[PDB]
Every structure is written in C-alpha cells, then in structure tokens.
Amino acid sequence: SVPSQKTYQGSYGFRLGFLHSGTAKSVTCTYSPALNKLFCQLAKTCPVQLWVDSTPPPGTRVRAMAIYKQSQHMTEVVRRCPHHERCSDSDGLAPPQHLIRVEGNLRAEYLDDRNTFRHSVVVPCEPPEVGSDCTTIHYNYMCYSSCMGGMNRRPILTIITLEDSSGNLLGRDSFEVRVCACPGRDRRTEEENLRKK
Numbered sequence: 589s590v591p592s593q594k595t596y597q598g599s600y601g602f603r604l605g606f607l608h609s610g611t612a613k614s615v616t617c618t619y620s621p622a623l624n625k626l627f628c629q630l631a632k633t634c635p636v637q638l639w640v641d642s643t644p645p646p647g648t649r650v651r652a653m654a655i656y657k658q659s660q661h662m663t664e665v666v667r668r669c670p671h672h673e674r675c676s677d678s679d680g681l682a683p684p685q686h687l688i689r690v691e692g693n694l695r696a697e698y699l700d701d702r703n704t705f706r707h708s709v710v711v712p713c714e715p716p717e718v719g720s721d722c723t724t725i726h727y728n729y730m731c732y733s734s735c736m737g738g739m740n741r742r743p744i745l746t747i748i749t750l751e752d753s754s755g756n757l758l759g760r761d762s763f764e765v766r767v768c769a770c771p772g773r774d775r776r777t778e779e780e781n782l783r784k785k
C-alpha cells in the first residue's frame with residue numbers, strides 16, 4: 589500500500605506555510621515554492637507552519653510521514669540508513685529508525701504502523717500563541733538523502749495530515765524534501781534547472 593499525497597484542505601481550510609530563508613551558503617533550511625521542495629541540513633530545525641481558516645475541534649492532531657516520491661519505490665518504507673539507525677543520537681522519544689522527528693514537544697508520539705510498518709510522528713494541535721496567526725511545528729530529518737542503504741539518493745515527500753481524535757482524515761498537504769550539506773546551493777541549482785527546462 590501507499591499513503592495518499594492528494595492535497596486536501598478539508599472543512600477547516602488546512603494548509604502549510606514556510607518561512608523565506610533565502611539561499612545563502614550558510615542557510616540550514618530553505619523552502620522552494622517553485623519546486624514545492626524543502627532543502628535542509630541533517631538534524632537541523634525545519635519550521636513548518638500550519639494554517640487553517642477555522643478552529644478544528646479539541647483533540648485534532650497533526651501527523652508527518654515520509655514516502656519515496658518515485659512510483660517504483662513508493663511501497664518501500666522510508667527509514668534511517670544502517671549507520672544512522674545505530675548512532676545513538678536518540679532524544680529519548682523518537683525511535684532510532686525514524687527519519688522524521690519533532691523537536692521540542694514532549695507530547696509528540698511516534699508510530700510504527702502494525703500493518704504497513706511505516707513510521708510517523710504525530711502531535712496535538714495547539715492554537716497559535718497570542719499575537720500569532722498560525723502554529724509552527726519544528727521538524728528534524730535524521731539522514732541525508734544520499735545515505736547509502738537508506739534513502740540512497742532517492743527523493744522523498746513529507747505528507748502532513750490533519751486528523752481527528754480517531755485518526756480520520758481532516759486535511760492533507762505535502763512537500764518534497766532533500767536533506768543535504770548545502771541546501772542554499774542545491775535550491776539555487778534545482779531552481780535553475782527548472783528554469784532552463
């Protein structure tokens with residue numbers, strides 16, 4: 589099986605937002621709207637905004653899951669490579685096999701699906717802080733796209749789903765991710781490739 593990636597705002601008008609970090613050599617996380625693609629360094633903070641048009645009910649949650657973007661790999665579970673799963677960099681909550689972690693939220697829950705074996709991380713929805721119009725989740729990606737025996741240079745998508753208390757779908761959005769040493773340079777390169785095409 590393969591999780592759906594269809595964008596779905598749903599009844600609450602759910603969608604993602606990203607900061608405008610630029611493409612300087614020093615940038616650690618940067619989002620390309622033209623590519624719908626996040627470029628980030630290993631284990632660095634990736635701020636992802638959640639936006640809604642109306643308030644979802646108490647108990648609504650936000651889940652993140654990675655899948656391979658290419659159809660011929662979509663049924664393979666995205667996991668950390670044989671090196672990183674053994675490097676003992678745990679935060680005490682994320683299983684060492686999980687690619688995606690949530691940073692700084694003790695209510696994050698990590699799921700190994702008993703039927704699909706896919707990994708995901710889910711947090712309770714919290715309303716924006718006073719003076720803010722959206723809520724931000726801080727994600728970390730714990731392997732490079734190039735890691736041998738893991739992603740092995742294959743592109744991935746992150747699927748973000750808004751779910752009710754039973755796990756039923758309320759909204760969905762997604763973005764491609766490249767985890768790399770120089771996200772600013774790679775974003776510039778890929779945007780230029782797109783322009784040349």
Ligand SMILES: CCCOc1cc(C(=O)O)c(O)c(I)c1-n1cccc1
Pocket residue numbers: 638639640642643644645646647648650712713714715716721722723
């Ligand atoms: C279910 C708890 C409340 O959830 C929200 C409420 C509001 C609001 O304006 O009332 C909001 O703007 C957002 I963004 C969320 N939200 C947090 C994560 C996903 C959606």
Ligand SMILES: [Zn+2]
Pocket residue numbers: 668669670671672673730731732735736738
């Ligand atoms: Zn790795």
